[PDB]
XYZ file of C-alpha atoms in Angstrom:
406
model
C 21.679 12.941 4.459
C 18.392 11.133 3.823
C 17.031 11.790 0.303
C 14.262 14.372 0.157
C 11.142 14.728 -1.957
C 11.460 18.493 -1.961
C 8.953 21.313 -2.421
C 10.652 22.245 -5.710
C 9.498 18.801 -6.896
C 5.917 18.995 -5.629
C 5.416 22.409 -7.243
C 5.681 20.645 -10.634
C 2.922 18.095 -9.860
C 0.352 18.130 -12.677
C -2.052 15.710 -14.387
C -1.038 14.713 -17.918
C -2.203 12.253 -20.555
C 0.700 9.996 -19.466
C -0.386 9.770 -15.811
C -4.225 9.713 -15.691
C -6.030 6.363 -15.554
C -9.268 5.678 -17.473
C -12.666 5.917 -15.826
C -13.510 2.899 -13.669
C -17.080 1.598 -14.022
C -18.515 -0.918 -11.511
C -17.872 -4.582 -12.360
C -20.405 -7.163 -13.480
C -20.121 -9.473 -10.441
C -18.444 -9.477 -7.018
C -16.512 -12.300 -5.366
C -18.511 -11.440 -2.213
C -21.316 -8.825 -2.453
C -21.744 -8.954 1.344
C -18.241 -7.554 2.056
C -16.268 -4.437 1.114
C -12.553 -4.780 0.415
C -9.651 -2.368 0.020
C -5.879 -2.164 0.698
C -4.874 -5.452 -0.955
C -1.524 -7.254 -1.150
C -0.127 -10.439 -2.703
C 1.274 -13.594 -1.169
C 4.815 -13.465 -2.562
C 7.783 -15.805 -2.481
C 10.928 -14.618 -0.722
C 12.453 -13.227 -3.946
C 9.312 -11.172 -4.642
C 7.470 -13.243 -7.243
C 3.757 -13.974 -6.848
C 3.605 -17.175 -4.822
C 1.871 -20.155 -6.388
C 0.657 -23.079 -4.266
C -0.680 -25.969 -6.335
C -1.505 -23.578 -9.161
C -3.254 -20.983 -6.971
C -2.462 -17.343 -6.251
C -3.384 -15.892 -2.869
C -4.166 -12.244 -2.084
C -5.167 -10.468 1.123
C -7.535 -7.527 1.642
C -8.716 -5.313 4.422
C -12.438 -5.987 4.753
C -15.506 -4.620 6.506
C -19.186 -5.545 6.190
C -20.941 -3.903 3.262
C -23.689 -2.929 5.725
C -21.241 -0.511 7.372
C -20.792 3.127 6.387
C -17.628 3.717 4.311
C -16.207 6.505 6.485
C -15.891 4.165 9.479
C -14.676 0.943 7.804
C -11.104 1.596 9.037
C -12.204 1.081 12.638
C -13.195 -2.596 12.124
C -10.879 -3.717 9.320
C -10.197 -7.471 9.227
C -7.809 -9.337 6.929
C -9.449 -11.769 4.482
C -7.778 -13.804 1.756
C -8.853 -14.718 -1.766
C -7.405 -17.286 -4.150
C -7.510 -17.878 -7.887
C -6.299 -20.246 -10.625
C -6.241 -17.748 -13.532
C -5.890 -14.303 -11.961
C -9.397 -13.015 -12.717
C -11.983 -15.199 -10.943
C -11.258 -14.912 -7.214
C -12.898 -17.060 -4.538
C -13.557 -15.750 -1.038
C -11.475 -17.615 1.531
C -12.744 -16.009 4.713
C -10.762 -14.370 7.508
C -7.132 -15.395 7.766
C -6.900 -15.171 11.602
C -9.161 -16.770 14.227
C -8.488 -14.119 16.822
C -5.338 -13.666 18.856
C -4.733 -10.702 16.533
C -2.733 -7.721 17.755
C -4.509 -4.368 17.853
C -8.103 -3.192 18.043
C -8.121 -3.743 14.281
C -5.684 -4.579 11.485
C -4.429 -2.381 8.637
C -2.515 -3.229 5.489
C 0.731 -5.200 5.349
C 2.335 -7.918 3.226
C 2.637 -11.701 2.994
C 5.621 -14.039 2.630
C 5.588 -17.761 1.859
C 9.132 -18.568 2.923
C 11.304 -21.293 1.416
C 10.701 -23.576 4.420
C 6.930 -23.388 3.765
C 6.095 -21.272 6.812
C 3.583 -18.496 6.154
C 4.226 -15.011 7.561
C 1.482 -12.376 7.308
C 2.754 -8.909 8.187
C 0.058 -6.392 9.097
C -0.477 -3.177 11.040
C -1.876 -3.375 14.571
C -4.115 -0.310 14.945
C -4.948 0.302 18.588
C -4.751 -2.333 21.304
C -6.975 -5.395 21.650
C -10.186 -4.697 23.555
C -9.802 -0.951 24.070
C -12.471 1.224 25.672
C -12.493 3.976 23.042
C -10.761 3.632 19.652
C -7.137 4.809 19.715
C -4.815 5.386 16.748
C -1.657 3.642 17.956
C 0.150 1.902 15.089
C 2.675 -0.939 15.460
C 4.214 -3.367 12.960
C 3.154 -6.939 13.797
C 3.317 -10.346 12.119
C 1.232 -13.481 12.233
C 3.915 -16.146 11.944
C 3.543 -19.876 11.532
C 0.687 -20.267 9.086
C 0.185 -23.278 6.851
C -1.265 -22.978 3.327
C -2.770 -26.172 1.859
C -4.072 -26.574 -1.705
C -6.216 -29.379 -3.165
C -8.042 -29.046 -6.536
C -11.180 -27.301 -5.127
C -9.587 -24.341 -3.321
C -7.017 -23.113 -0.777
C -7.068 -23.273 3.033
C -4.942 -21.050 5.282
C -4.834 -22.868 8.609
C -3.377 -22.308 12.052
C -2.128 -22.229 14.632
C -1.074 -18.617 14.099
C 1.310 -16.840 16.455
C 1.116 -13.050 16.584
C 3.533 -10.514 17.987
C 4.577 -6.922 17.515
C 7.785 -6.526 15.486
C 8.451 -2.800 15.490
C 7.420 0.365 17.305
C 8.804 3.842 16.560
C 12.059 4.557 18.376
C 11.479 8.313 18.698
C 14.884 9.334 17.288
C 14.616 8.283 13.609
C 10.858 7.609 13.515
C 8.374 9.842 15.313
C 6.275 8.600 18.250
C 2.625 9.447 18.869
C 3.617 11.771 21.739
C 5.852 13.657 19.271
C 3.179 14.057 16.587
C 2.309 17.646 15.780
C -0.365 18.581 13.242
C -2.053 15.411 12.021
C -1.933 11.951 13.582
C 1.408 10.182 13.224
C 1.974 7.132 11.052
C 3.864 3.899 11.636
C 2.267 1.229 9.458
C 2.151 -0.808 6.222
C 5.018 -3.329 6.635
C 6.218 -4.626 3.255
C 8.777 -7.432 3.168
C 11.555 -7.111 0.596
C 14.635 -9.221 -0.074
C 17.185 -7.236 -2.074
C 17.981 -9.334 -5.181
C 21.508 -7.826 -5.293
C 22.928 -8.022 -1.767
C 20.589 -10.807 -0.636
C 19.971 -8.883 2.587
C 16.487 -8.906 4.106
C 14.556 -5.673 4.692
C 11.094 -4.572 5.808
C 9.778 -1.227 4.541
C 7.068 0.810 6.245
C 5.491 4.249 6.333
C 6.659 6.434 9.222
C 7.124 10.060 10.215
C 10.469 11.596 11.066
C 10.572 13.778 14.183
C 11.360 17.466 13.740
C 12.148 19.366 16.965
C 10.261 22.485 17.955
C 11.705 25.634 16.440
C 14.233 23.506 14.566
C 14.048 25.902 11.615
C 14.248 22.902 9.282
C 11.728 24.625 6.995
C 10.932 28.124 5.786
C 7.604 28.119 7.653
C 6.861 26.565 11.072
C 3.572 25.003 9.912
C 5.335 23.136 7.098
C 7.326 21.155 9.696
C 4.083 19.386 10.675
C 4.220 17.449 7.356
C 7.034 14.965 7.990
C 6.140 11.780 6.139
C 8.927 9.334 5.368
C 9.495 5.786 4.141
C 11.296 3.907 6.891
C 13.153 0.626 6.565
C 14.303 -2.062 8.983
C 16.922 -4.736 8.427
C 17.116 -8.380 9.493
C 20.733 -9.537 9.954
C 19.890 -13.253 10.251
C 17.181 -13.093 7.574
C 14.588 -14.360 10.067
C 11.319 -12.652 9.049
C 10.627 -11.896 12.735
C 13.963 -10.398 13.915
C 14.304 -6.766 12.813
C 16.503 -3.753 13.574
C 15.525 -0.208 12.551
C 17.591 1.669 9.941
C 17.696 5.251 8.724
C 14.778 6.126 6.421
C 15.009 5.670 2.659
C 13.201 8.892 1.772
C 11.556 11.873 3.483
C 8.881 14.269 2.269
C 9.510 16.935 4.891
C 7.428 20.076 4.191
C 5.640 18.261 1.326
C 3.416 15.460 2.602
C 2.331 13.858 5.889
C 1.337 10.390 4.624
C 3.506 8.328 2.269
C 1.143 5.356 2.365
C 1.959 1.726 1.444
C 5.564 1.971 0.224
C 7.111 -0.763 -1.883
C 10.037 -1.318 -4.245
C 10.120 -2.852 -7.710
C 13.619 -3.698 -8.940
C 13.910 -3.541 -12.718
C 17.128 -4.255 -14.613
C 19.312 -2.916 -11.844
C 17.230 0.112 -10.879
C 15.203 0.422 -7.691
C 11.799 2.075 -8.082
C 10.183 3.121 -4.801
C 6.424 3.705 -4.989
C 4.159 5.327 -2.388
C 0.462 6.177 -2.505
C -0.596 9.572 -1.196
C -3.683 11.698 -0.554
C -4.413 15.231 -1.738
C -5.445 16.505 1.710
C -2.112 15.421 3.252
C -0.030 17.898 1.221
C 1.595 20.816 3.027
C 0.154 24.292 2.382
C 1.244 25.943 -0.845
C 1.253 22.611 -2.733
C -1.536 21.035 -4.815
C -1.165 17.346 -5.599
C -3.857 14.767 -6.368
C -4.621 11.428 -4.788
C -2.161 9.217 -6.612
C 0.761 6.831 -6.863
C 4.083 8.703 -6.651
C 7.430 7.139 -7.452
C 11.183 7.584 -7.210
C 14.197 5.798 -8.687
C 17.789 5.142 -7.621
C 20.602 2.726 -8.464
C 20.581 0.978 -5.059
C 17.981 0.205 -2.397
C 19.372 2.827 0.013
C 20.590 5.233 -2.687
C 19.834 8.827 -3.667
C 16.208 8.604 -4.786
C 15.014 11.129 -7.381
C 11.369 11.662 -8.351
C 9.860 10.035 -11.424
C 8.594 12.396 -14.141
C 10.217 15.387 -12.394
C 7.368 15.950 -9.939
C 7.045 12.415 -8.584
C 3.546 11.717 -9.922
C 3.442 8.298 -11.582
C -0.277 7.548 -11.716
C -3.429 9.488 -10.845
C -7.208 9.625 -11.299
C -8.921 11.967 -13.781
C -10.160 15.342 -12.582
C -13.823 14.403 -13.161
C -13.524 11.234 -11.006
C -10.667 12.114 -8.667
C -11.251 9.554 -5.881
C -12.180 6.483 -7.953
C -9.088 4.451 -7.036
C -6.435 4.390 -4.323
C -3.806 2.248 -2.551
C -1.909 1.065 -5.629
C 0.715 -1.721 -5.637
C 3.288 -2.120 -8.419
C 4.732 -5.420 -9.658
C 6.760 -6.469 -12.687
C 5.368 -8.519 -15.567
C 7.860 -9.286 -18.132
C 8.627 -5.833 -19.686
C 5.605 -3.958 -18.249
C 4.812 -2.758 -14.761
C 1.349 -3.620 -13.514
C -0.337 -1.476 -10.880
C -3.322 -2.761 -8.905
C -5.414 -0.476 -6.737
C -8.929 -0.757 -5.394
C -12.164 0.938 -6.467
C -12.749 3.660 -3.945
C -15.121 6.639 -4.178
C -17.041 7.187 -7.400
C -20.028 9.163 -8.709
C -19.429 12.146 -6.414
C -20.549 14.643 -9.084
C -18.802 17.636 -7.550
C -18.736 16.743 -3.872
C -15.620 16.547 -1.712
C -14.958 13.627 0.622
C -16.058 15.429 3.807
C -19.269 16.400 1.989
C -20.103 12.705 1.501
C -20.305 12.258 5.290
C -23.435 14.454 5.297
C -25.359 12.213 2.876
C -27.854 9.533 3.937
C -26.473 6.023 4.647
C -27.461 4.558 1.253
C -26.284 7.561 -0.767
C -22.897 6.986 0.906
C -22.810 3.183 0.397
C -23.794 3.678 -3.260
C -20.667 5.807 -3.849
C -18.151 3.250 -2.560
C -16.825 0.441 -4.710
C -15.065 -1.944 -2.370
C -13.676 -4.096 -5.202
C -10.478 -4.343 -7.235
C -9.648 -1.669 -9.798
C -8.772 -2.456 -13.435
C -5.093 -3.366 -13.350
C -3.091 -0.588 -15.013
C -0.216 -1.301 -17.410
C 2.649 1.209 -17.409
C 6.043 1.318 -19.125
C 9.121 2.571 -17.306
C 11.816 4.192 -19.439
C 14.299 5.673 -16.960
C 13.025 8.260 -14.518
C 9.958 8.654 -16.785
C 6.709 6.648 -16.901
C 3.717 6.359 -19.209
C 0.319 4.699 -18.841
C -0.055 2.185 -21.673
C -3.327 0.418 -20.896
C -5.573 -1.501 -18.527
C -6.709 -5.087 -17.962
C -9.828 -6.682 -16.478
C -10.940 -5.805 -12.937
C -8.394 -7.137 -10.443
C -6.300 -9.114 -12.945
C -3.134 -10.328 -11.203
C -1.269 -12.360 -13.853
C 1.833 -14.479 -13.479
C 4.902 -13.978 -15.627
C 3.954 -17.380 -17.086
C 0.835 -15.760 -18.646
C 0.725 -13.568 -21.757
C -1.304 -10.317 -21.640
C -3.392 -8.879 -24.509
C -1.732 -6.686 -27.122
C -1.727 -2.891 -26.835
C -2.583 -0.141 -29.361
């Protein structure tokens, strides 16, 4: 009886003054002008707080050379880390892994600085190392055994790193590549999460749930091709490398194909599940924008219901609809901060597939590759409201006070 983001929900999706973010303009300086970054995550303690090592925060980004065309950056994505003392001025720390990485390339994940001091960097292994032609096989892997050292000049993430695959789709609860109809399947974005109530250890991820041929599970056969779901795995011992698959938390069958980068924020006893999603991954008959969608329940594996009635928590304005993507939510004392990245801007009227026609520089000029202005929202139940923004890529601690709001 897995909870469902239903079509009756998605039909109500609509931009409102409470869900549209302000226009993002390019920032004054870049931490590294020679690199593009997207899909970023924080180094967190086991409980979920932003980890601090000798006064420094650490974040991780997917990166590709700025020389490269945007459309293809996902084929050569490498994980880099950045560190900061305040939360605004980030220093480039270079690649986190010196090879031995699983997959042809790496996609987004999460990072855990355990109590023992061991560093675990969960990521997605896209493809297999040293393939002939690029494949789209996705597996949940981890780079265990890292050591983070911090003097007063910066932060070093050193080896030796040990990499292995943690999870692959079983084919019964989570669809395999062979089973994928319609668009390419998904099995990626591992996010570590310790439940602050039970204490149990979980790992969330984005998956698809298999629907048999002719199953009749939907009112139209084509709709069954859109089978995105948020899967979860459990660790009985708590070891961040020993996992067993569970039944999925939420399914968007006949609504959306990709529920990208899922994560949970627990706030005063309520579990808010957030997922980013594209507009082109919606099933036919539904119109939803690129945005952060959210659901709330009273337990981690409970009956999720969509925020704001439709599910839309946060979205870009109509006249700049691709400016940000891949949002992550995190608590700061009585606000919820949401950090995305600066994606596609200054399109005028063009669609994303239209941009592929343009000359190399006209494409590179329309891609940010930096952090978006951190958005401040206020949760009030199953209803949200955008309350403001902060500086570009501001990740503050709960120890820090944020500017006042109108």
